[PDB]
Enzyme design. Sequence first.
Site, PDB file in Angstrom:
ATOM      1  N   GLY A 108      51.578  36.839  71.370  1.00  0.00           N
ATOM      2  CA  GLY A 108      51.585  37.642  72.587  1.00  0.00           C
ATOM      3  C   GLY A 108      50.584  37.184  73.654  1.00  0.00           C
ATOM      4  N   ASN A 157      52.196  41.971  65.043  1.00  0.00           N
ATOM      5  CA  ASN A 157      53.245  41.736  66.043  1.00  0.00           C
ATOM      6  C   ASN A 157      54.646  41.630  65.415  1.00  0.00           C
ATOM      7  OD1 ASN A 157      54.396  41.309  68.579  1.00  0.00           O
ATOM      8  ND2 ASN A 157      53.853  39.210  68.737  1.00  0.00           N
ATOM      9  N   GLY A 389      47.552  30.946  65.755  1.00  0.00           N
ATOM     10  CA  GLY A 389      46.116  31.190  65.834  1.00  0.00           C
ATOM     11  C   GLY A 389      45.480  31.470  64.475  1.00  0.00           C
TER      12      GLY A 389
END
Lengths: 720, 148, 371, 371, 371
Positions: A108, A157, A389
Site C-alpha cells: 500500500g 493488507n 518489505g
Amino acid sequence: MESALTARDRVGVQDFVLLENFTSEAAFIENLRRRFRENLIYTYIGPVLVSVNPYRDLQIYSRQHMERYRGVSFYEVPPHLFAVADTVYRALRTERRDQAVMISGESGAGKTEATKRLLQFYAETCPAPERGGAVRDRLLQSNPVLEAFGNAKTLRNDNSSRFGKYMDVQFDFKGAPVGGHILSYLLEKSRVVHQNHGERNFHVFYQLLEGGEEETLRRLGLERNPQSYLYLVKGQCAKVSSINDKSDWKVMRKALSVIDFTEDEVEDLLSIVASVLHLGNIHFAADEDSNAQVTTENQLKYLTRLLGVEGTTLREALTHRKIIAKGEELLSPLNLEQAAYARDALAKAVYSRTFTWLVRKINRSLASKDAESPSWRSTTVLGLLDIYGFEVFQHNSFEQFCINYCNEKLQQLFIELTLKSEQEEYEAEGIAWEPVQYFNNKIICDLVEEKFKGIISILDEECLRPGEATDLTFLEKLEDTVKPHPHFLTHKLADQKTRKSLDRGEFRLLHYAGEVTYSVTGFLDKNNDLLFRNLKETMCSSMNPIMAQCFDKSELSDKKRPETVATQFKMSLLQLVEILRSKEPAYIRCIKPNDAKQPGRFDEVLIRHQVKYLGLMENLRVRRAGFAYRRKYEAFLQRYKSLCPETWPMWAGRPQDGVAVLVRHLGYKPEEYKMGRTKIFIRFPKTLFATEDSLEVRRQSLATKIQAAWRGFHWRQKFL
Amino acid sequence: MADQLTEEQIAEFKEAFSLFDKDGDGTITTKELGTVMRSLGQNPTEAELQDMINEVDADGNGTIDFPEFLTMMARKMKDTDSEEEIREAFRVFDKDGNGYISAAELRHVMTNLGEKLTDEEVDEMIREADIDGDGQVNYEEFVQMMTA
Amino acid sequence: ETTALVCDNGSGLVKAGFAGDDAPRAVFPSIVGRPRHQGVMVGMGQKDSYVGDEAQSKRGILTLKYPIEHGIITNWDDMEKIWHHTFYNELRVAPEEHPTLLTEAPLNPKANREKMTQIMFETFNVPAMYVAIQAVLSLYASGRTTGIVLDSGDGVTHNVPIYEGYALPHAIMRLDLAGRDLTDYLMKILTERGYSFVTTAEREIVRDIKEKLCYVALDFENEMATAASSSSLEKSYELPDGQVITIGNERFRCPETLFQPSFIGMESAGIHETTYNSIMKCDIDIRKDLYANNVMSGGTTMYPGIADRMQKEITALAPSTMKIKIIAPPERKYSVWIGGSILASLSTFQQMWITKQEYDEAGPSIVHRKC
Amino acid sequence: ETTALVCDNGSGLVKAGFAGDDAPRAVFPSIVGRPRHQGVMVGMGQKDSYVGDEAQSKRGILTLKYPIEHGIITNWDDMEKIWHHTFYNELRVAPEEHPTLLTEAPLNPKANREKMTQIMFETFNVPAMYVAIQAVLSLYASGRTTGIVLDSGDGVTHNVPIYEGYALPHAIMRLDLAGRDLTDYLMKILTERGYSFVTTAEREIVRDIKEKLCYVALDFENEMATAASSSSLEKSYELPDGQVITIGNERFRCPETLFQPSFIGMESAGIHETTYNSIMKCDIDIRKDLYANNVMSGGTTMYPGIADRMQKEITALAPSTMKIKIIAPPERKYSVWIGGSILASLSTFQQMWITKQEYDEAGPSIVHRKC
Amino acid sequence: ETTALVCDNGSGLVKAGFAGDDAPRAVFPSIVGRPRHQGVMVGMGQKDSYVGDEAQSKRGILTLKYPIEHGIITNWDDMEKIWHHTFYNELRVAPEEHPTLLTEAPLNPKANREKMTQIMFETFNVPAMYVAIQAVLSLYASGRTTGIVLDSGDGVTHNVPIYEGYALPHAIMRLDLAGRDLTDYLMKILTERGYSFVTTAEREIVRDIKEKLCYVALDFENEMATAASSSSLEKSYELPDGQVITIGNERFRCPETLFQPSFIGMESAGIHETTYNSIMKCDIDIRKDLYANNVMSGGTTMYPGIADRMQKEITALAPSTMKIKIIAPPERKYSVWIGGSILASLSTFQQMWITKQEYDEAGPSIVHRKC
Ligand SMILES: Nc1ncnc2c1ncn2[C@@H]1O[C@H](COP(=O)(O)OP(=O)(O)O)[C@@H](O)[C@H]1O
Ligand SMILES: Nc1ncnc2c1ncn2[C@@H]1O[C@H](COP(=O)(O)OP(=O)(O)O)[C@@H](O)[C@H]1O
Ligand SMILES: [Mg+2]
Ligand SMILES: [Mg+2]
Ligand SMILES: [Mg+2]
C-alpha cells in the site's frame, strides 16, 4: 541543489544528508511531514529516493514533468520519481552497462503505482514510443495474473505481494526500447499449504471458487463454498475479504486472454489450480508398520484427469519414497507424517512451478522479435525489482522469518554498495577516510546463513535429524548453539526485565529494522519440502501440457535429497543478491502515511515504524559520511565568488585557489571544510546554510547594480 | 575626487542640464540630480544620490544649482561597474549557465530586492530586455546593450 | 567441492557417495582380482590387478580375493587399491578436497581404525575423517532414536540397542555369521545334489543363486517335510555356461543357518535369540520400546519371509503382552550408508570430525578419543 | 502477580502452587537424573540432567538421584535444579513477584532452613519467604485448632501434638522411617520369590508395586497364617516389559514395618506406639481431646486398613474409657499442601513473612528467630 | 561312616568333602557338557553328558553349561547330575549315610532352599541337611566372632556384617557381579587387540587369562597412563594351539570392573563403596570393629594387588582416625569350605540339622524356619 536552502523553514531540506541534527529520527519524520503536507513529497538520501503515498492525482507525473527531467542530473534539480528514471536512463546510455531500479515498501506504499509511473515515463520519453508502448502494455497487463497467483491477504493488507517480482525493459545500442522480461524470485510457497489465523491462501483459489462458470467448474471436484477444501480453511478467513473475488476473477480471465493464453492453456491452468484443492483433500490412514494408504478414490478420480497421471501411479507416488541404487529401484513406504509432507510438498511444487511457468510464458512473449545477434552491436536492460518489505505482525512465524532475512540481506547489499561508493569517492578526491560506526549487517546475516551455525543451517537439521523432533526442540537447539551471539535472544536467555515481553516457544533477532520476535509453532511443519524423485518422475510422465513443461526427465538424474524451503529460499535469494551486485542499482523507498487511505493524515506511529522498516537512519548515517556536502570547485566558485571580492567577478588562479580565498573570506574554520582533488568538502551543513544566506543578502547589491545600470541606460534612450 | 572637472566635461553636463532647465526653470530637483546624471550615462544608486544630497540639502527648496551638481558629479566620477561585473550580477540567477533568465524572474529580482524598479520601469525594461520577444531575457546580450 | 565423502566399506560390497545423496554413487563388490594364467597375447592390455566390476567381469581368469575378513581389513596392500578405485575410478573425486566418513562393525580390533585413519591422512591426504559403527547409522536411515538394530553385512552380523539416542554398549552383541558364511555353506549343501563348486569365481555363482532363490522358512521342520514329499518348492537357475541347476530344500536349508548356526558348527545362538538376549540385557524400562522398534539392515536380512520368521520367533521369546514389530524396509540393503548420508550432513556433526591437524598432534591414536 | 507461592519440598514428591489453590499445581518426583551411558546420536537435544517427570520418563538411561535424605536436603546443586524446575517449568513464574512459603519436618538439622533461606534470597531473589513445620499445616487442612498429627512422607515420619493452637515442643516425636525405607524393604523382601530389583530406575517400579498392591493387616499373625496356607490374598502386577509378578504375604509385610520397625533393625517402636508416646508426653488434662483428634497425613498413611489398624492398636494402649477417633480423610496425601495454601491465605499471616529487607539486615540467621 | 558331608556349590566351582578335612577333597568346575557334533565313531561310546573334569578335558566337542546363575540354580536336571557326580564319582560315598551341609548366597530365592531340600531327601535320601549363608561360614575359617565379610564367588559378590556372632540382616548387601561377568568383560576387551573368543569352550580359555595375567591396579589412572606409554606392563600368554596372545592394560581393565561396575553398564556401586555402605548401616559403636576386620573370601578376591587397593579405597571413605585392616589369607579361595568344615564339626551344631523326620512333617517349607 543549493537553490532550496533559503526555504529551510517553509519546506525543509531536499536531501536529508544536509540535516544538521541528522541522528534525530524525530526531525527526519518532521521534515517528511512538512514536505508531505506541502505536497513536495519526494526526497533523496544522496543517490537514493524516499517517497510517501499522497493518495491523490498529483500532476507531478505529467508529460511536461517528463520533458523537464529528461537529460538533467539528479542533484542539480529538485527530487521527483522521474529524476531517478532519467538518471538510470542516462547511466544506461553513458556507461552502456545495464542498470536497475529497486522499489521497496510496506504494501500500500505505492510500489506497483511507482513502477507503472516509471514505465510510462520510459514509454513516452524514449526514442521508439510504439515498441516501448507494447512492452509497457504487456508488462502492466501481466499484473492481474501475477497477483491472482502470487498475492495474498495477510493480517495487515487484503492484497499483499508474497513474491519478489522483477522486470526488465530491453534496450539497444541506439537507446530505443527493444522488448522486456519478467522474473519472480522469493515466492512464499509455504502459504499454498498452510495459513496463520486471519490469512488467506493465494487469491486464485478463492477467485476460482467464487468466479462462476459452474459448467466449466463441473469437470473438477467443484464446491462453490471454499470451506470445503483443507488448504483454504486453516486461516479461518475465506469469506471476510473487503475485495470481491468474483469481479477480480473476470479481470484475471480477461487478462489471460489479452496475454495470449490459448483456451487449452487456460483449461489446463484451471485444472492445475483445481488439482491443488484435491491434493489438499487427501486423507491418509496407517497399516501394519504405520505405513500410509490413501483412504478414498473421491480425490483421485479428479486428480488423475487434472494432473494427467495414472491413479495407480499417483496413489503409489504419494505413499512411496523411491531410491535408485546400483541400477535397481526400491519403493520404500511412507508413514502418516511423510505422506502428509509428500502431498503438501507436491502442492507447493505443482503451484510454484505453474507460477514460474505463468512468468516464463510472458518472459518468452516480451523478448526481442529482431535476432539480437551480431551484427547487433550491444544488448542492454533497465531493471525494476519490486520486492516485499520487512514485515512485522503480532505473531511473526516462518514466513516472516524468511521475508525479514531477505530484507536483512537486501539491506546488507544496499549498505555495502553505498559505503563503498562513499569510500571510493573519498579516495578519488584524495580525502583520508573518516572512521564511522554503523550497524554492519554482516554480523547478523551470518546468524541466519552461516554454513553450520546459522538459523537456516539448524532449522534444516531439525527437518533431517532422526526420531521425535518438535518446534520447541528446534528452539532448545538454538539456545544450545547460537547462545552468546549479541543479536539473538529467547525467553530462557533473557534477563528478568526483558523476559516479560518474549515467551516460551519464541526467539528474537535484532534486525536492521529493530528487534523482531519469532513464534516457533509450525517451523518444522513449514520448512519441509520432501518431494522425492518418485513424485517428479510421476508428474513429468503426465499427459497435461503444463505438467509436461514444468517437470522434466533431467532432474531425475540428481542424487540429492529434497532441499527444505529455508535452503530453497536462501539459494533463490543469493542468486537475486549476485544478480543485483552485477549492477549499480538505484533505490526507491516508499512510506504509507496512514491505514485510512486518507490524504493529508500523517500517522507518525505508523511512519516511525516504516522509517525503521526501510533502514533510513543507517542509510542517512552512511551517506552523511564524515562530510555532509561536496561540490566541483568551478560550480561552487561560480555561485559564491560574489562573497569574496578577490574572486569577483572572475578568478585567475586554480578554481581551488579561488575557493580557498573565498573560504578564508567566509571565515570557515580548518575543521568545518576540506579541499579535495577537484571538490570542496563541508563537515557541518550550517556552513553551507550561512553561505546561501550570505548570497541571499549579496543579491540585494547585485539587484541594486542592475537597477542603477538600467536607469543609467534608460535616461540615455529616452533623452540626450 | 578623481579629477578637477573642467570645460570639456562641463560642456556635456550643461547641454544635458539644458533639457531639465527646459523652458527656463534654472535649477534641478534633489532626486532629479540622478535623472541628469543618468542622462549623462552615469549609474548612481538612489542611496549614493541621497548621501550626496544630504550635504547640499542644508536649507530645503527641493532643488540644486549647476556648480553643486558639478560638485556631486565630481564625487561620482571615480569608477563605475564593468560589463563583466554586471553580467555576473545576472549570471548568478542563470538556470544552467545557458545565457537566459525569464522576464518574470527579472521582474522578481527587480521588485523583491532593494532600490526596486517601479512597475512602469520594469515594463519599460522588459520592453527591450525580452530581446527574442518570448519572455526570456538573454542577459549576456542585454548587459552588453545596457553597459554600452 | 567441499561435500563430505561417505564410504561404507562393506565386507562384500563397497558403498560410497557424498553426504546429501540418497543412494551411493559407487557400489561394487569388495574384491581385488589378480590374473591366474600365463599372458599369452602381447599388446592385449592385461593389468596386474582388477577391482569391483572390472574384476567380476573377468571371473574365470582371476583369483578373486576380498581384502576384508569378518568386517576386519585383512590385506592393506589390496585395500589401498579399493579406496583408490573408489575415489579415482568410481566417484571421480580428489580426496584432498573431502572430509571422509568411514564405517565399521562394533567390537572390531583397534588396529583396524588406526590403520584406516593412517591411510586416509597419509596416503589420501583427506582434510578430516570419522569412523561410525554401522548399526548406529542404520537408526538415522530408519528415522528413529529408540530401537534395536540387527545389521547383517556379508562377513558379520551385529545387534546394537539404543534408547533416546544412548547406545547401551554392554548390550551390544556381535555374531561372526552373515552372507559369505551362508554362501560357503550353500556351496557345501549343493554337493548333495551333485552340483560341485570350489573355485574363488564359483563362490560368486553360488552367491548369485542365494540372492535370487533362497528364502527363510516360517516353520523349518514343516517346510523341510513339505520339500521331502513334493516338488512344488523346487526352482531352477541357469549357470554362466548354460547348464541348468535345480534346487528344493536347499532354498531354505541355507538361510535357516542364521537361526541355527550349528549348521556351520558354530555354538552361538540364532539371530532371533541373539536379538532377544540383547533386549534382555537392557534395563527393564527400555525393553517395551525395543520390541516396538526392532530394526533390520544390511543385505543378509533380505531373504523372503525373514522378518515374518523373526517376528514369530521373538513373539515366542518375549512376554505375551508385548506388541513386537520388526522394521525391515524395502531399501534395507543400503540403510547403513543412508545413515552416513544423514549424519555427515548434520550441522552439529561438523565439530565431530578428526581434522588432519588433530592427526598431526596425536597420530592414529586420536580416533579412540573421538569415535 | 502478587499471590503467595507455596512449596512443600516433599522428601519424595515436590508439591507446589499458589495460596488459594485447592490442590498443588505441580506434583512431580523429587528426582534429578543424569545420563548413565555414551550419547551416540548427534545433536539429539540430550541434557546433562533431567528433573522430575522428565527423569521419571527416561528411567532406563538415567541414574535417578534424590536430593533429600529423610526430609534433610543432602545435595544443594540438585535442589537448586528442583526449585528451578518448579518455578520456571511447572509453575511458570518469576519468584521475585511471589512471597514463597516453604516447609520442613521438625527436629531437622539446623542449617537446612538457613541454606533454604539463603537460596531463596541470594539465588531466586524472592520478595519474602517462610518455613512452616509440615505437620502444623496438616491441622490447618483438617480445619481443627486441636489434634495430634501423624505425618508420614517419603523420607520421614513425625508426630506433632497441638492443643488449641499451642504446639507442645517437648512432646513432638520424629521417626526416620517412611515410604522410601519401605520401598527399600520391599526391594529386599521381593527377592524371596525370585524377583530382583537393584538399580535406582527399578526402585521406582518397586515403589509402583508398593502404591498399588500393599495394605495394612488388621491383625498381622492372622493374615500371615492366612497367606502361608491359602492363595486367597495374592495379587499380580505387570512389569514395564510385560513380565508378570505375583505376590502374597509381601503385600502386608511391607506396610507392617511401620508397626514393627525391627524388620529394618530399628531401635524405636512403631507408628502406633510413637503416636501413644506423643499423646502421653502431653500433661494429663488434654489427652482425651488428642485421642478424639488423631489427624493423619502424607502419602505413607494411604494404605488400605491403616486407619482401622491404628484405631485397633491405640485402643489397646489407651484406657478402655477413651472415645478414640482417627481423622484419615480421602485426600490425606496433600494435607500439607492444603494447609500451606490456607496459612499463606490468612490476613493475620501477612506481617509474619521474612522479607528481603530483614534478610539483608539479619542474614540467613533470621529463620531461627522468625519461625 | 558317620561324618557330615559339606558341599559348597559354587556358582562356578563345586567344592566338596567331609567335615574335619583341612581342604575340599573334590574341587571341580560346576559344568555339564553335552556333545555338539554328530557321533564320531561306532563303538567309541560318547556319553550323552559329561561333568566337571571330563567336560574340562573334552571342551572342544561340548556345549559347556553352568547350572548356577549368580548363585541361583537355574537348571535343576543338570544340578542333580552335578551332585550325583560329587557324591558317587568324586567323593565315592553313599549319601544315605551322611548328614549334608549345603550353602547358598544371601538374599537368594526361597524356591532355591526348598528345591535343594527336596532333592537331598527325595533323591539322595540323606539322613539330615542344613543350608548355610556362605559369608557366615567364611568367619569360622577366619577364626573371628566379629567382622564384615566381602565374599566374591564366580557368580555373586556379597557383604555380610556380623558382630559377636549376631548377623545384621538389614545391613547385608548382594551384588550380582563376580568372576563370570569379569570373564565376559575380559572376552570383550581382548577383541580390541584382535583376539576373538565366542564359544563356551573359549570362555574357559579366557578364564585362564583372567587367573594367570590379570591384576588390580593400585591406582587406575597411573597404571593406565603407564601402560599407554611403556611396554613393561605387557605380558604374553600362549593359547591351547600355540597362537600367542600379548596383553597390556587388558590386565587391569578386567579387575577394575569390581571398583567400577559402570564398565558392565551396571549402575550399582563398586565393591569398596558396598563394603563401606554396609558398615554405614551397622550401628555406630561397632563400625570401629568392622574396619579392623574386613574379611575377603571366594576366588574373585585372589588378584595381585586387591588387598592394597581395597585398603586404600576404604581409607578415603572412612574417618581418618579409624584403623582399616583387611584379612585376605593365602587360602581365601577355600575359606567358605574351611568354614563349612569347622561349622559341621561343632558339637553345638549337631542339634541344628534338619532331619528327614522334620521334612516328613513340614515338607520343603522347613528351611524357612530352621536356617
Ligand atoms: N496408595 C498409596 N499407598 C501407599 N503409599 C503411597 C500411596 N500413594 C502414594 N504413596 C507413597 O507416598 C509417598 C509420598 O508421600 P508425600 O507426602 O508426598 O511424600 P513427601 O512429602 O515426603 O514427598 C511415597 O512413598 C509414595 O510411594
Ligand atoms: N588366582 C586367581 N586370580 C583371579 N581370579 C581367580 C583366581 N583363582 C580363581 N579365580 C576366579 O574365581 C572364580 C571362582 O571362585 P570360587 O569361589 O572358587 O568359585 P565359586 O564362587 O563358584 O565358589 C572364577 O571366576 C575364577 O576364574
Ligand atoms: Mg551385507
Ligand atoms: Mg509429604
Ligand atoms: Mg565361591
